[PDB]
Amino acid sequence: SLRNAENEFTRIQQSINLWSLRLPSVKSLRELMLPHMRQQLDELNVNDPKA
Amino acid sequence: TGQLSAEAKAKYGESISSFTQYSNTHQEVRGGDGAKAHGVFSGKKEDFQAW
């Protein structure tokens, strides 16, 4: 009788990083938002939770 | 006058082999640019110089 077994596994990870973008969360940021998005936000009838 | 011959023979063999290899490597680079930084993982001097 003969029994012969092999197992093999590899894992590789590679990562590259390049520049990060940050946004300061100042109050004037609302003025930079797209107008159709802005009116969509402030037309939200928050009296309806489903909305 | 009678003749008898008897023989018994037995042989047994067992053999076991095991092999195990494990490798781990971790590399990290900061600064330069990330694309050249990935080049140092070649381990090749010109790419290290390029970083």
One-letter-per-residue 3-state SS of A1-51 = CCCCCCCCCCCCCCCCCCCCCCCCCCCCHHHHCCHHHHHHHHCCCCCCCCC
Cβ–Cβ contact B37 with A under 8 A: yes
Amino acid, res. A41: L
C-alpha closest to that of B40 among B32, B51, B30, B31: B51
Give the 3-state DSSP-derived string for chain B, with helices as H, strands as E and coil as C.
CCCCCCCCCCCCCCCCCCCCCCCCCCCCCCCCCHHHHHHHHHCCHHHHHHC
Residue A18 has φ and ψ, to the nearest 5°, of -140, -175
Contact A16, B38 (CB under 8 A): yes
Instruction: For chain B, say whether A10 makes contact (Cβ under 8 Å).
Output: no
Q: What is the resolution of this structure in A?
A: 2.6
Chain A residues with CB inside 8 Å of B37's CB?
A: 16
Note whether A1 contacts B: Cβ–Cβ < 8 A. Answer: no
- How far is the alpha carbon of A4 from chain B, nearest alpha carbon, in Å? 9
How far, CA to CA in Å, does A51 sit from each of A34, A41, B18, B21? 20, 11, 65, 59
Handedness of CA B41, B42, B48, B51 (dihedral sign): negative
Q: Are A18 and B37 inside 8 Å of each other by CB?
A: no
CB atoms < 10 A from the CB of B36, how many?
14
Q: Which distant-in-sequence residues (6+ apart) come within 8 Å of B30 by Cβ?
A: B37
**Residue found under tokens 């050249």:** B36
Q: Using a CB-CB distance cutoff of 8 angstroms, which residues of chain B are in contact with residue A16?
A: 34-35, 37-38
